[PDB]
Design a protein around this ligand. Structure first.
Ligand SMILES: [Mg+2]
Ligand SMILES: [Mg+2]
Ligand SMILES: [Mg+2]
Ligand SMILES: [Mg+2]
Ligand SMILES: [Mg+2]
Ligand SMILES: [Mg+2]
Ligand SMILES: [Mg+2]
Ligand SMILES: [Mg+2]
Ligand SMILES: [Mg+2]
Ligand SMILES: [Mg+2]
Ligand SMILES: [Mg+2]
Ligand SMILES: [Mg+2]
Ligand SMILES: [Mg+2]
Ligand SMILES: [Mg+2]
Ligand SMILES: [Mg+2]
Ligand SMILES: [Mg+2]
Ligand SMILES: [Mg+2]
Ligand SMILES: [Mg+2]
Ligand SMILES: [Zn+2]
Lengths: 108, 166, 290, 148, 152, 304
RNA sequence: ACUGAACUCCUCACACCCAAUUGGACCAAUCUAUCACCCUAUAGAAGAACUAAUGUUAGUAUAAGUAACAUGAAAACAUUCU
């Protein structure tokens, strides 16, 4: 079917600008106590998560170097190590991954 | 094309006498030719329309719409220049005075329908405008009380005249 | 007469504040470094005896001002609205901090202050109200308390539940006004000019003057009411969201002079409890605390 | 049109007629040209009428300018401070004279719709009607269906 | 009408549904932590937990081997399942996987969840942490607890 | 900002608060198990024209039940859970011909309830109930608020009316909502198989109000009239009622005496104000049965 | 008895309510001759006036932010899987 008459600006302005079609204010925002950036509650801090994922990205890169080719996932557990630290007695008998930097504060 | 909004930052007022209220600082800023619909931009403009800078940046951060990051940029640019050039003491004590989107210049392409028929498609562009006023944001007008309704009704009855006499 | 007394004390407070303001040669730029976990190495170039931790906060964001309750200046608790003295390291303290020990202490100290404020102006002039002090009480204890001496006429007089609800709404009114807790640090003498009428405040001032190597004492003003405090307070009254004056208890060895310990419990706006949980907290504050 | 335009109530300046009548026209400013047909009609108005007109009403100050112009005009100023501009242009001496008379016998109040024709400051003598005029009175002022 | 419909329709049909979930599961086994759309993470999550229980049955179980064969596409992960993952979760009876909501995807604006098997080698996810016991409210509640225990 | 009850509680306090509020609901239920002992209202003997209070029951599920004639009757099971009297309103105040009794249902959490409602229940001294329904009663039927109610309130042979919200089928088409025939599947029939027909007559330039057309189906109150009560389990407070009852399982129904003309004056022998177990006049057995019902654990039925 | 028109009277004013058609009094703007000289005069000329042709060109609306369109998965982005 086809419109029988042009809708006026006022009619349209009532459609468009009612509270239903408006953007609602979010009330669940907070400050990330860790980094001090803004995070939504119920959601992980975007900054903090990026930080983790950049670290874990590099760890996965070192995993590839040592593994060296597809279909070579080991049958032991894994541990990650940084500059100036040694595997414990219980750490013995599992895969070691080395690093060229200091251990992060948040990663313990 | 007109570019009035830019020039608004070049207005110089003469120095105030010590016996005067401290004039709020005043920053006008915009972005032109945003590839986004002007009416779509309106909703985001309308949202931040009366809030403080930080509170607007907060609201804009978690907003999913495309233009939301664009407005965030404009606001941060405006805040930066406010402190640097417009002699604003604190960056936090700014609120959005007016937030407006205009139609920018548009192009026309063709859309190919069935049979031989076609239509004229428009690559939509728009501008965004903002104004920042130094100081705490204005407290919203309180909702009208029963006593206020009553008060004004009394006023209204008292305004009656005997009509079409001397 | 009390109505003239209150305004007299204000004029005296104001003139000392003006005196302390005037001895500052124009403005000296002090440097303050942010030693917080968040946004590190920020340096604020502040006015010497003008700028506050609040002013530093409001350089950063509204999130600081909204959720900053105390300051550490060289690792000492410091009022939000207290003007600085010298270059230092500054960090801000919130309620949801890991160790909010200092923050909790400051909160209760402030609530007790405003309870004393509302009690003073709750009774008619024919009766005598005498505020003595607010003792230091652990937050893990029932509630905050202020000790009061009333008139000999009201020796038999015990407050009813309706009277308690009356105080409740009265203190609530104070919160609604949203009054900043102005602070002033002075020598003992000028403070004695402020409080010479009540001996119960005279000796308390003398106590603070003696314990400190200098004669420095802290006076906290909430709009009009001046009171002697033992440490830093909360910035504004709005911080409180729930506030009920729970009970009044008579102390036992009070044959020479009766002591009435007013007790009430409060929670700040950031840490608000559900209806049921607050109710059980009121129950505990009804118990006499030592 | 009445809705489409503003309105006023009937008035005078400072209760004109009450004590003594005061002519409201205060100043007249005639702009004429030495040459050119537009000002021709006006030119001979200054030949004859201006002089005797000025004698007739000593209250009005008349200024004649005599400078080049394509349209001759007259600026009427009133006591209250209204300014009325009228382009005499190509008008005969007689119809210019009628204009200048029409200006001189009016006030500075604007010509819009004038609502009521009549204006009283004391409309009643006996007392304005109210619902308790011509309604009788009761014993002890008792309302209907009173208990006692 | 669809009350108590448990599984959510996903791919271009039930076969595809399984196939997507199997791919997700394969990834998670290998890498131990994976970002994917919130619905799909939630959907796959259950099958991930059920896989550890089959893994707990051991190499010797022929049924469990056939299951692992189907659900792991890499075939090198099957030893890892049985000799790494199953031994790791010996104590716990359940609750091997954790899921969290992270910021929405940039391109798509989709809800995104990270899922990880617990006790992995990787850097730990920023996790929601309840406020300290020293907070004003917690101290007042600890006060009430003291009252009740010391009353008797 | 919005705050729920857990926002600011440590891991140590959470279990403590949970157990504390659990204790208090148990304590509040414990207090009110002796209605007659606590100062009650006058108890009036039944006279014709009188109406008593009802109950709020949860629908557990459905079962078969057998009669001696050998016929199978399906029964629905209704469990009376934490049913209490809430408020009494006089005939004057309610602006009705009958006085009114408020009855509460399934016990629910305090943390998810409204401020004022929490206040109301505090004054009563009972934990918050999920549903509330109002019963129209005569003056004699008045019961002091706080008084618990039991399934033995009803007895076998009694007919009841049952109202609940029906099962919600959301936006439905005309065919499943109104049982419209629809159009054939073959022989042409282009894109019309389940469409409503002609809506209205052409002469009228509108559509009559209350016409049947596609819309939201179910999720509305409906009552089933004159359901016989076959059986009462006194221990679990189970009512067994004939046939089908509206709404899903684990929903709350309102059950009262039947309104139908046939059973107008049948309330003579039925425990008038309510059944009071604390009275100890006669201790009611584990189960109560109708005459016709075949007892579980009775010898196999012969038609001899 | 009263109410009740543009009829009639009243105070002023008077060319100032028919289609096609016919007669008449003026006049916007433009150019020319001569004036004028913050926008006019007297005449002579003329592509000399648009609320309407499914008019022709350009711009922007309505329908409408509607219909419609689009990228297999995970990841070290090496690779692998469906
Ligand atoms: Mg073609
Ligand atoms: Mg278009
Ligand atoms: Mg799909
Ligand atoms: Mg069919
Ligand atoms: Mg066809
Ligand atoms: Mg078909
Ligand atoms: Mg008439
Ligand atoms: Mg006539
Ligand atoms: Mg006539
Ligand atoms: Mg001409
Ligand atoms: Mg033409
Ligand atoms: Mg036109
Ligand atoms: Mg057409
Ligand atoms: Mg058309
Ligand atoms: Mg046209
Ligand atoms: Mg549009
Ligand atoms: Mg539409
Ligand atoms: Mg579509
Ligand atoms: Zn963070």
């Amino acid at each position: 079917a086809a419109p029988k008459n042009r809708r006026t600006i006022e009619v349209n302005r009532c459609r468009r600008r009612n509270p239903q079609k408006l953007i609602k204010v979010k009330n669940n925002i907070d400050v990330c106590p860790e980094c001090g950036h803004l995070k939504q509650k119920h959601v992980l801090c975007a900054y903090c998560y990026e930080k983790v994922c950049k670290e874990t990205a590099e760890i996965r890169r070192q995993i590839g170097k040592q593994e060296g080719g597809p279909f070579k996932a080991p049958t032991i557990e894994t541990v990650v190590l940084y500059t100036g630290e040694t595997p414990s007695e219980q750490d013995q008998g599992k895969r070691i991954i080395e690093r060229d930097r200091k251990r992060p504060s948040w990663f313990t | 094309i007109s570019r009035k909004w830019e020039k608004k930052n070049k207005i110089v007022y003469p120095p105030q006498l010590p016996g005067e209220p401290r004039r709020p600082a005043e920053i006008y800023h915009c972005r032109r030719q945003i590839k986004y619909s002007k009416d779509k931009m309106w909703y985001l403009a309308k949202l931040i329309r009366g809030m403080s800078i930080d509170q607007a940046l907060a609201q804009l951060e978690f907003n999913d719409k495309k233009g939301a990051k664009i407005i965030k940029e404009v606001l941060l640019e405006a805040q930066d220049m406010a402190v640097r050039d417009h002699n604003v003491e604190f960056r936090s004590n700014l609120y959005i005075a007016e937030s407006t989107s205009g139609r920018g210049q548009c192009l026309k392409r063709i859309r190919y329908h069935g049979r031989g028929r076609f239509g004229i498609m428009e690559k939509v562009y728009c501008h965004y405008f903002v104004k920042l006023v130094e100081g705490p944001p204005p407290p919203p007008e309180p909702p009208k009380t029963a006593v206020a309704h009553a008060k004004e009704y009394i006023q209204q009855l008292r305004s009656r005249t005997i009509v079409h006499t001397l | 007469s009390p109505t003239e007394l209150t305004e007299m004390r204000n004029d005296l407070f104001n003139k000392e504040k003006a005196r302390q303001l005037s001895l500052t040669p124009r403005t000296e730029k002090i440097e303050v470094k942010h030693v917080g976990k968040t946004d590190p190495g920020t340096v604020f170039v502040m006015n010497k005896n003008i700028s506050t931790p609040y002013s530093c906060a409001m350089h950063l964001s509204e999130w600081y001002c909204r959720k900053s309750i105390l300051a550490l200046v060289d690792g000492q608790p410091w009022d939000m609205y207290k003007p600085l003295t010298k270059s230092c390291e500054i960090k801000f303290l919130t309620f949801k901090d890991c160790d909010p020990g200092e923050v909790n202490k400051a909160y209760w100290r402030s609530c007790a202050m405003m309870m004393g404020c509302v009690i003073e102006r709750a009774f008619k002039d024919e009766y005598m109200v005498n505020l003595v002090r607010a003792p230091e009480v652990p937050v893990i204890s029932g509630a905050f308390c202020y000790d009061v001496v009333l008139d000999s006429k009201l020796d038999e007089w015990m407050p009813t539940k309706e009277n308690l609800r009356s105080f409740t709404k009265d203190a609530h009114a104070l919160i609604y006004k949203d009054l900043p807790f102005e602070t002033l640090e002075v020598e003992a003498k000028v403070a004695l000019e402020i409080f010479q009428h009540s001996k119960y405040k005279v000796d308390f001032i003398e106590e603070k003057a003696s314990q400190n190597p200098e004669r420095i004492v802290k006076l906290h003003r909430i709009g009009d009411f001046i009171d002697v405090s033992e440490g830093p307070l909360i910035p504004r009254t709005s911080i409180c969201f729930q506030y009920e004056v729970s009970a009044v208890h008579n102390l036992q060895p009070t044959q020479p002079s009766l002591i009435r310990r007013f007790q009430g419990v409060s929670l700040p706006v950031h840490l608000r409890a559900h209806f049921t949980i607050w109710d059980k907290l009121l129950e505990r504050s009804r118990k006499m605390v030592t | 049109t009445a809705r489409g335009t503003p309105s006023r109530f009937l008035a005078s300046v400072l209760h004109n007629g009450l004590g003594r009548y005061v002519q409201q026209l205060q100043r007249l400013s005639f702009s004429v040209s030495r040459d050119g047909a537009s000002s021709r009609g006006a030119r001979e108005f200054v030949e004859r009428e201006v002089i005797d007109f000025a004698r007739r009403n000593p209250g009005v100050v008349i200024y004649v300018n005599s400078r080049p112009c394509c349209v001759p005009r007259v600026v009427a100023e009133y006591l209250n401070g209204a300014v009325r501009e009228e382009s005499i242009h190509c008008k005969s001496v007689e119809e210019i004279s009628t204009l200048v008379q029409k200006l001189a016998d009016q006030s500075g109040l604007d010509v819009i719709r004038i609502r009521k024709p009549f204006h009283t400051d004391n409309p009643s003598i006996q007392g304005q009607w109210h619902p308790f005029t011509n309604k009788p009175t009761t014993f002890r002022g008792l309302r209907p269906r009173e208990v006692q | 009408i669809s009350h108590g419909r448990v599984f959510r329709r996903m791919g271009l049909g039930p076969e595809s549904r399984i196939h997507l979930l199997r791919n997700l599961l394969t990834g998670l086994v290998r890498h131990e932590r994976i970002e994917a759309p919130w619905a799909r993470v939630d959907e796959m999550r259950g099958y991930a937990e059920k896989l550890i229980d089959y893994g707990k049955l051991g190499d010797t179980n022929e049924r469990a081997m056939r299951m692992a064969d189907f659900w792991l596409t890499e075939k090198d992960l099957i030893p890892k399942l049985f000799q790494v993952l199953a031994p790791r979760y010996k104590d716990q009876t359940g609750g091997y996987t954790r899921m969290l909501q992270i910021p929405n995807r940039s391109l798509d604006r989709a809800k995104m969840a990270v899922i990880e098997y617990k006790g992995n080698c990787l850097p730990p996810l920023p996790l929601p942490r309840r406020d300290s016991h020293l907070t004003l409210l917690n101290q007042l509640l600890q006060g009430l607890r003291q009252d009740l225990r010391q009353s008797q | 900002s919005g705050t729920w009850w857990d926002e600011h509680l440590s891991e140590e306090n959470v279990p403590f608060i949970k157990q504390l509020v659990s204790d208090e609901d148990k304590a509040q239920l414990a207090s009110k198990l002796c209605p007659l002992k606590d100062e009650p209202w006058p108890i009036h003997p039944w006279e014709p024209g009188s109406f008593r209070v009802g109950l709020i029951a949860l629908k557990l599920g459905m079962m078969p039940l057998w009669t001696k004639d050998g016929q199978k009757h399906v029964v629905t099971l209704l469990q009376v859970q934490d049913c209490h009297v809430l408020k009494y309103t006089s005939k004057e105040n309610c602006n009705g011909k009958m006085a009114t009794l408020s009855v509460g249902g399934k016990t629910v959490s305090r943390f998810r309830k409204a401020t004022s409602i929490l206040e109301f229940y505090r004054e009563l001294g009972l934990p918050p109930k999920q549903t509330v329904k109002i019963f129209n009663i005569t003056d004699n039927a008045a019961i002091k608020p706080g008084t618990p109610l039991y399934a033995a309130h009803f007895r076998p042979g009694q007919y009841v009316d049952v109202t609940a919200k029906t099962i919600g089928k959301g936006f439905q088409g005309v065919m499943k909502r109104w049982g419209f025939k629809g159009q054939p599947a073959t022989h042409g029939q282009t894109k019309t198989h389940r469409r409503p027909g002609a809506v209205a007559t052409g002469d009228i330039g509108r559509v009559w109000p209350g016409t049947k057309m596609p819309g939201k189906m179910g999720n509305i109150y409906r009552t089933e009239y004159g359901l016989k009560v076959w059986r009462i389990n006194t221990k679990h407070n189970i009512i067994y009622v004939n046939g089908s009852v509206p709404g899903h399982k684990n929903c709350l129904v309102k059950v009262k005496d039947s309104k139908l003309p046939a059973y107008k004056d049948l309330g003579k022998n039925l425990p008038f104000p309510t059944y009071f177990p604390d009275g100890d006049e006669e201790e009611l057995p584990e189960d109560l049965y109708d005459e016709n019902v075949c007892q579980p654990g009775a010898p196999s039925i012969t038609f001899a």
